[PDB]
């Protein structure tokens, strides 16, 4: 695979496909990418930082199980009595399976950074005119093991979320689609923006994806890493309509169920795209790219 040569400089094996330790070099570029994104934040944008876990009930309510039940990572633990837990440990000692004593917690590993923001916003009452804007981030998890450096199970996502009337949201995504390309261009990156769909699970879900592409609810900034026929989505631009407004009972300033949308940056994909394009020697990066990043 075309990205495999970047591994030695960027990553250390942690014994599981899609889960890597990050070198100082790699993390320095993720950090500069994050600062660059921050510097383009719209005014009036509330910034929240989420942990890698979130409420299972909140995610269930958000419909994630209808869409991607095969990607969800759930948090489980030994919740029994001391005797039960000791027996579990005993089976382990004997070289057997202690994991049969596991049961679900009330937590999942967050599959996307924006999910926890909707209930938070909803607890505030009706939206002001012009809706609300959030800057969110989280380490996310998706259960899709791969050896490819651009398909991870654990990865940083960064999002700007807009909640408001349909105009606030559409205008928001319009601004960001343009702005994101200007950013990619200043990063010396090769890309195009195209209609996409989320990978909905099952045959039913295959049709949801078709209707999603047809309604143009999802765009991706696509970057040729391994091949130009098979480029990698490093950003997405998402229109959710009233889905979250309805679910969480968020009202826009006109009494109506709020629309929501988000602009998502795959921090690790962007960082890998940067190293693939410009190499692992920062002193050699183009002057304009070094400048844009504040190197």
């Amino acid at each position: 695979d075309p990205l495999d040569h970047l591994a030695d400089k960027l990553f250390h094996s942690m014994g599981s496909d899609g889960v890597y330790a990050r070198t100082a070099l790699y993390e320095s570029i993720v950090e500069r990418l994050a600062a660059l994104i921050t510097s383009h934040r719209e005014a009036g944008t509330e910034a929240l930082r989420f942990p890698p876990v979130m409420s299972r009930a909140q995610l269930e309510k958000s419909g994630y199980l209808k869409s991607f039940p095969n990607l969800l990572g759930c948090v489980c633990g030994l919740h029994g009595t001391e005797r039960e837990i000791n027996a579990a440990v005993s089976r382990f000692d004997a070289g057997g399976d202690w994991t049969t004593s596991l049961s679900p917690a009330d937590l999942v590993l967050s599959p996307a950074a924006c999910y926890p923001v909707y209930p938070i916003a909803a607890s505030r009452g009706p939206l002001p005119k012009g809706g609300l804007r959030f800057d969110v981030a989280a380490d996310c998890f998706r259960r899709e093991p791969s050896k490819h450096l651009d398909r991870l199970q654990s990865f940083r996502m960064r999002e700007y979320v807009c909640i408001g009337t349909p105009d606030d949201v559409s205008d928001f995504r319009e601004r960001w689609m343009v702005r994101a390309q200007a950013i990619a261009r200043d990063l010396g990156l090769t890309f195009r923006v195209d209609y996409a769909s989320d990978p909905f699970f099952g045959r039913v879900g295959q049709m949801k994806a078709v209707s999603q592409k047809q309604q143009q609810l999802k765009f991706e900034l696509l970057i040729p890493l391994r091949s130009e026929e098979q480029p990698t989505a490093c950003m997405s631009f998402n229109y959710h309509r009233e889905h979250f407004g309805t679910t969480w009972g968020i009202q826009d300033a006109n009494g109506e169920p709020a629309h929501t949308g988000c602009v998502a940056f795959g921090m690790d994909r962007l960082a890998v795209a940067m190293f693939h394009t410009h190499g692992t020697d920062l002193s050699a990066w183009p002057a304009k790219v070094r400048d844009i990043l504040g190197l």
């Binding site: 039913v204 049709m207 949801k208 209707s211 999603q212």
Partner: peptide, 22 residues
């Protein structure tokens, strides 16, 4: 078919009617 007004749930319920008729 989308200019008509068919949303995702509308399209899902549409795949269901076609798989049903034949």
């Amino acid at each position: 078919l989308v200019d008509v007004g068919l949303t995702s749930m509308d399209m899902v319920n549409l795949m269901l009617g076609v798989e049903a008729e034949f």
